[PDB]
Amino acid sequence: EVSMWDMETGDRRFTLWASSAPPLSELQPSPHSVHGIYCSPADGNPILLTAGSDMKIRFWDLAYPERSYVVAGSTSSPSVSYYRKIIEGTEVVQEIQNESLPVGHHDIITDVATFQTTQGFIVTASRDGIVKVWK
Amino acid sequence: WESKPPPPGWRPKGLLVAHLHEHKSAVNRIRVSDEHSLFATCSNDGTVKIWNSQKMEGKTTTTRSILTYSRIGGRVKTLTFCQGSHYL
Amino acid sequence: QKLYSRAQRHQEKKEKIQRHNRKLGDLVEKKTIDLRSHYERLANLRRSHILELTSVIFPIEEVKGDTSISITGPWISLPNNGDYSAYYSNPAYTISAALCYATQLVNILSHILDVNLPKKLCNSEFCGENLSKQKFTRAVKKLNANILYLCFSQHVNLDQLQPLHTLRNLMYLVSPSSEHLGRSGP
Amino acid sequence: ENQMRYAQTQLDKLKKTNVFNATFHIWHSGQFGTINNFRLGRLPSVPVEWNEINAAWGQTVLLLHALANKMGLKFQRYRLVPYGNHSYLESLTDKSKELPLYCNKFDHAMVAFLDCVQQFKEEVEKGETRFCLPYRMDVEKGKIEDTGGSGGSYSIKTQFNSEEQWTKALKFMLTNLKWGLAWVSSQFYN
């Protein structure tokens, strides 16, 4: 879940729906989530980098989430798939999915940190001590 | 929520600098320095690994945590870089 | 009274969350035990594969870092430190064969030892090309850094292998005689 | 759970791709013979590196030496230099004139390699159910013959066989060594 809440109503009204649970599902059939979000305004909407508990290195988009590029892995997935909708006065998004050594973290990643100036690096970690310093 | 909001078109790519597994236990608290080029690493082992981007990146024998202090004890899972307070 | 009803609900929620906390703690303990078991199984498998490889392709053995180590037949034998200083251009030939096998086995261990190469393209560039020039500098630097990473993840005794003991630490860790063979992690 | 998943996935990948599997990184079919991610045999419209050819030749010398030291396969022309490019293949009984696996000495190395390959096939075929007979390799006359009935004429000569026949014979050697090392890995893993 990555939602934006109107605290006046005090509930989240924003989505990138990717879960076995239906939107605001009572049982939430999907227990997976994403955290460690980083916020900055650009490209007509907020631009965020949040740690995807699914190990999905999340460079997230709203207007064209499928169109843009993100740091996540899972190369078996075709061109990025993200749904853009407008639902009851707000634009709703549904996120849909598309030898060697596992490069991606192998623990519950939570923390992200990046620095750059026209170029730079980012820091990643997992739920056990994994350190990932992305450029 | 970032200084100097960037122009549109931000997308990620497949590059990185270094990886570490020094933290004996889970790490769930880090602090990123503002005036300098360093970030803090702490682990559920009650120990904190200090890492400097300038040093840890490479061109050096080992990219070990510069400041590793465990006198705190317990599990260190809460850290912060004080805003212009010269304290952590 | 309204606030008290809300608080009683929140307190029942707290009790349930604490029960779930205990359950999740026991489960995380079991999961960590399983992860440690998987790491130990990887250690054992890596030890077996490395012993088999050392026996078959590269019998890395000491002579009987100046002392020489023999591997891949009599045509290939080299001392512990590693003649990096002599690469500016069988000693040359044996050293080159040893270094080719070294980069290959470096990737091999990266797979088995799970030590993914920060310069993954190791075997090819390291083994063949007569890159004595600055490219040799960069390659030797990458090789030394990777060997340092290997010795650190297998830092059973840093003072024993010591710096400038390429073949020395290579045989020590790689040979099944390693004190902590198969270990991986922090 | 995720860390154990990564660890067990690496372990399972190693189990599937045996040590020899990665070391050889060889293929049985394709535009050329592939071992350790190499291309064996060029064509009038196919690019390949002859320096990579010498590298793969040294790799073949090292692999044949390891196999022979593992079990037989070292009757004659059994003294091979497992060093790589400019490799040498000589008999343990004969060392008067070196046979360089690089540059009639190169074709001589090819013929001696065919001889050692037939010796190994004898070693490989020793199983109760005969093995290494999807094709047959001839040492002296330069014949790379497939028991699968393929009509393609493959020879080991440096002339009239260097592009199509050479590519085919290199890939055939790769696949035969693939079968032999597959048996070797099946044995060794146990």
Distance CA A130, CA A115 (A): 19
Unique residue bearing structure tokens 């169109």: A67
Instruction: Judge: D7–A107 Cβ closer than 8 Å, yes or no.
Output: no
CB-nearest to C186 from B24, B58, B61 is B24
Distance CA D48, CA D52 (A): 8
A22 three-class SS: coil
Q: What is C111-132 written as a DSSP string?
A: HHT----TT---HHHHHT---T
Please give the C-alpha separations between residue A41 and each of A1, A80, B4, B88, in angstroms, as whole numbers.
Answer: 20, 22, 9, 28
CB pairs under 8 A between B and C: 10
CB-nearest to B2 from A40, A68, A113 is A40
**In the beta sheet, which residues pair with residue C23?**
none
Unique residue bearing structure tokens 């199984």: C41
Task: Give how far C128 is from chain B: nearest CA, Å.
Answer: 25
Looking only at the bridges linking them, the beta strands covering A112-116 and A120-125 are antiparallel
CA angle D36/D40/D46 to nearest 5° reads 120
Q: Which two tokens stand for residue C87?
A: 């690469």
Q: Which residues in chain C have Cβ-Cβ distances shorter than 8 Å to D10? A: 42, 111, 114
Q: Which two tokens stand for residue D44?
A: 């009038």
**In the beta sheet, which residues pair with residue A46?**
A41
Instruction: Judge: A130–B21 Cβ closer than 8 Å, yes or no.
Output: yes
**In the beta sheet, which residues pair with residue A58?**
A50
CB pairs under 8 A between C and D: 80
Distance CA A101, CA D6 (A): 8
Burial class (CB in 10 A: 0-12, 13-18, 19+), C69: buried
Judge whether D13 is closer than 8 Å to chain A, CB to CB. Answer: yes
Instruction: Judge: A121–B19 Cβ closer than 8 Å, yes or no.
Output: no
Q: How many of the other CB atoms lie within 10 Å of CB of C1?
A: 5
Please give the C-alpha separations between residue B68 and each of A4, B45, B47, C6, C46, in angstroms, as whole numbers.
Answer: 38, 11, 7, 45, 31
Instruction: Judge: B24–C148 Cβ closer than 8 Å, yes or no.
Output: no
Provide the Cα torsion D57, D62, D63, D66; round to 10°: 160
Q: Quick one: chain C helix, strand, coil %, rounded to 5?
A: 65, 5, 30
Instruction: Judge: B22–C145 Cβ closer than 8 Å, yes or no.
Output: no
User: Please, are residues A29 and A21 in contact by the beta-carbon 8 Å criterion?
Assistant: yes
Nearest residue of A to residue D25 by CA position? Answer: A99
Instruction: Judge: A101–C186 Cβ closer than 8 Å, yes or no.
Output: no
- Give the phi and the psi of residue C154 in degrees, each rounded to 5: -120, 45
Q: Which residues in chain B have Cβ-Cβ distances shorter than 8 Å to C118? A: 18
Distance CA A35, CA A28 (A): 17
Provide the Cα torsion D167, D168, D169, D173; round to 10°: 100
Reported structure resolution in angstroms: 6.8
Distance CA A79, CA D5 (A): 26
Chain A interface, Cβ < 8 Å to C: 99, 101, 103, 129
User: Please, are residues D171 and D41 in contact by the beta-carbon 8 Å criterion?
Assistant: yes
Distance CA C158, CA C150 (A): 11
User: Please, are residues C100 and D56 in contact by the beta-carbon 8 Å criterion?
Assistant: no
Q: Which residues in chain B have Cβ-Cβ distances shorter than 8 Å to A126? A: 27
C107 three-class SS: helix
Q: How many of the other CB atoms lie within 10 Å of CB of D129?
A: 5
CB-nearest to A55 from D2, D21, D22 is D2
Please give the C-alpha separations between residue B10 and each of A61, A120, B7, in angstroms, as whole numbers.
Answer: 9, 13, 8
CB-nearest to B21 from C145, C148, C186 is C186
Nearest residue of B to residue C185 by CA position? Answer: B21
User: Please, are residues D7 and A106 in contact by the beta-carbon 8 Å criterion?
Assistant: yes
Instruction: Judge: A99–D3 Cβ closer than 8 Å, yes or no.
Output: no
Please give the C-alpha separations between residue A22 and each of A14, A32, A114, C20, in angstroms, as whole numbers.
Answer: 14, 13, 33, 24
- Give the phi and the psi of residue A87 in degrees, each rounded to 5: -130, 110
Nearest residue of A to residue C112 by CA position? Answer: A101
> Which has the closest alpha carbon to B60: C48, C184, D8, C144?
C144
Tallying the residues shown for chain C, one arrives at: 186
Give the method of determination: cryo-EM
User: Please, are residues D173 and D117 in contact by the beta-carbon 8 Å criterion?
Assistant: yes
Judge whether A78 is closer than 8 Å to chain D, CB to CB. Answer: no
Q: CA end-to-end span of chain A, whole Å?
A: 27
Instruction: Judge: C57–D62 Cβ closer than 8 Å, yes or no.
Output: yes
